[PDB]
């Protein structure tokens, strides 16, 4: 197919052939698997102290005083799982493998399929993104990588009728539950992904919900956040070309 290239003012500047990978059939089950693997592989090993509740010489008196055979020390019950200040029976262990394996071919096919989900304008709108376009992905000229100001990228996206997605992601949710106490207080919608070629867009990164990436290392999570395919993306002409041999 064909993809229309845009200059820094939002005007048409030719067009190059949209690569073959964008014609790979959307496979949400494989994409969801690749994201689940990525999200679990960064999870840290935890576990309670191996000796918690075991640091006591508590002994059970046995039969005789009309009491249950529970280990006691100073009249206070200890050690056993049913006792207050006792050990945890089947607690979280550090020795546990919290990582998920994925075959390279199966993971690569998911990257390709997620890249393909970018091409379908109906899927992109179904995922949640707010925009006024027919053609998708938004293809911009290589002169994008040279922008320094963030407010200049705003002007370009307003010219491309694609800014409404950042107005969507400009609303933080204060999460329900104790995640708050651990630093995970806020969360916001995932908006536009900016795929470049040389270095990630310093100019676009601070935009609400925007994620920046590079064509040599853009993954399934960037392409399909939370396993949901069809992210509103914007490539660089050379990024669109480099993302072909993936």
């Amino acid at each position: 197919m064909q993809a229309t290239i845009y200059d820094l003012d939002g005007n048409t500047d030719g067009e190059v052939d949209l690569p073959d990978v964008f014609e790979t059939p959307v496979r949400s089950d494989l994409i969801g698997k690749a994201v689940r693997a990525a999200q679990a592989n960064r999870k840290q090993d935890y576990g309670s102290d191996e000796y918690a509740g075991l640091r006591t010489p508590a002994e059970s008196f046995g039969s005789g005083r009309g009491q249950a055979h529970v280990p006691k020390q100073d009249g206070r019950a200890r050690r056993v799982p049913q006792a207050v200040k006792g050990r945890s029976a089947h607690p979280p262990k550090t020795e546990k493998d919290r990582s998920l394996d994925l075959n390279d071919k199966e993971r690569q096919l998911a990257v390709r399929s997620a890249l393909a989900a970018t091409a379908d304008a109906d899927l992109v709108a179904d995922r949640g993104h707010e925009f006024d376009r027919d053609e998708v992905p938004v293809v911009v000229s290589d002169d994008f990588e040279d922008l320094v100001k963030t407010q200049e990228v705003v002007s370009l996206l307003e010219a491309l009728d694609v800014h409404a997605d950042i107005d969507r992601a400009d609303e933080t949710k204060i999460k329900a539950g104790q995640g708050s106490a651990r630093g995970r207080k806020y969360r916001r919608p995932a908006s536009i992904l900016f795929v470049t070629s040389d270095e990630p867009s310093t100019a676009a990164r601070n935009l609400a919900g925007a994620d920046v990436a590079t064509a040599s290392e853009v993954n399934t999570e960037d392409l399909a956040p939370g396993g949901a395919p069809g992210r509103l993306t914007v490539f660089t002409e050379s990024a669109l070309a480099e993302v072909a041999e993936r």
Partner: protein, 115 residues
């Protein structure tokens, strides 16, 4: 519970073709596809060369693999083909998707089931 959306669609399309048209194979291939993956066909080329004949479509209710030689000018229809199978078949015939075979022949005529 098949997790692949494409396999789910194919099975639905095989059923629709078995009911609407005169096909008694497409709904029979749908029944084997609904069965567990281990019961599916993993057919090599040396088997299609042994039992297939020309101008009669070969339907595989699974996947075609590339071991052995195929000389016959046959049209093989399957759920999937290995990279080497599709290449070796297209040399002396045609490797057609099962999704296409339904549109080409909804009545399921002149077809041999090979597993």
């Amino acid at each position: 519970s098949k997790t692949n959306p494409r396999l789910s669609s194919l099975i639905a399309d095989l059923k629709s073709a078995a009911r609407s048209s005169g096909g008694a194979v497409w709904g029979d291939v749908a029944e084997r596809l609904e069965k567990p993956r281990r019961t599916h066909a993993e057919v090599n080329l040396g088997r299609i060369e042994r039992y297939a004949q020309e101008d009669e479509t070969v339907v595989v209710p699974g996947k075609v693999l590339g071991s052995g030689v195929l000389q016959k000018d046959v049209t093989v229809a399957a759920v999937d083909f290995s990279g080497t199978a599709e290449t070796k078949i297209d040399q002396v015939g045609e490797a057609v998707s099962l999704e296409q075979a339904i549109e080409n022949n909804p009545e399921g005529s002149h077809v041999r089931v090979i597993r």
